[PDB]
């Protein structure tokens, strides 16, 4: 959306503040805001994978204890 859908976009739009799973919930006489507009779970604004380096945190310093199929 270009222009402000509910002033934020790609967090969605339904009843009033809350999330994509939480919107059969409330399809509610309220109706103030957006049941799936305030969390739809995506991230914003991650520091971390902005800043180039390593794919996960566990990845830099990582030991990995080898198990030499012992169960
Ligand atoms: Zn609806």
Known sequence: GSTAMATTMEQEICAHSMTFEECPKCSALQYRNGFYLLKYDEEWYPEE?????????????????????TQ
């Open 49 to 69: 994978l902005l800043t180039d380096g390593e794919d996960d945190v566990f990845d830099p310093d990582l030991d990995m204890e080898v198990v030499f199929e």
